[PDB]
């Protein structure tokens, strides 16, 4: 429950990322999958037997886990088994409120003894993500 990334145990070797994404979006909600990655032993033509999928919301992850526990995920005569992943594909917070877009960023120091702040350089339209788990 710490992170939204889920590792799929067994997937067919003949499939591509697009097919698995379409299957997940058909069984789960529409565009509820953020990152899907299938490791390849070779450079670009020998995928492995497992894959890691990152969901947008924790509720989608819980629903996918419930479906996997009931063996209701059958993709090309293969029963997908879902397990927790060691690390996320992308360090992105689950909560949409934490994600801040198009905010002005400035730096400085308390130049004066009174409540006066000096601005050295101001950056506009920066992206701020608050990762509670990573403490950064």
């Amino acid at each position: 429950t710490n992170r939204s990334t889920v590792k799929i145990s067994n997937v067919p070797q003949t499939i591509v990322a697009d097919e698995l994404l379409r299957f997940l979006e058909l069984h789960l909600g529409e565009d509820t999958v953020f990152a899907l990655e299938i490791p390849t032993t070779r450079d670009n033509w020998k995928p492995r037997d497992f894959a890691r999928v990152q969901f947008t919301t924790l509720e989608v992850k819980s629903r996918a886990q419930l479906l996997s526990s009931q063996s209701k995920l059958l993709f090309k005569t293969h029963n997908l088994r879902l397990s927790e992943a060691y690390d996320d594909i992308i360090p992105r917070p689950v909560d949409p409120r934490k994600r801040l877009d198009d905010i002005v960023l400035t730096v400085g120091f308390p130049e004066s003894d009174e409540k006066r702040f000096c601005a050295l350089e101001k950056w506009d339209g920066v992206r701020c993500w608050i990762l509670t788990e990573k403490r950064r």
Partner: protein, 53 residues
């Protein structure tokens, strides 16, 4: 469309498939393979009748 011969029909009023002319199946496992590919293993079950000819 997967069936090689006209063994299944689509009913417009009920919006569901129906079995029409079941004697022209020719025992080609095309509809079963299509159902398995679509993700439904036990959608259509067809077996020969041993005591009927």
């Amino acid at each position: 469309e997967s069936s090689p011969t006209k063994v299944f029909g689509m009913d417009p009023v009920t919006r569901q498939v129906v079995v029409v002319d079941p004697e022209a199946y020719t025992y080609d496992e095309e509809v079963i393979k299509k159902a398995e590919a679509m993700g439904k293993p036990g959608l259509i079950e067809i077996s020969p009748k041993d005591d009927s000819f």
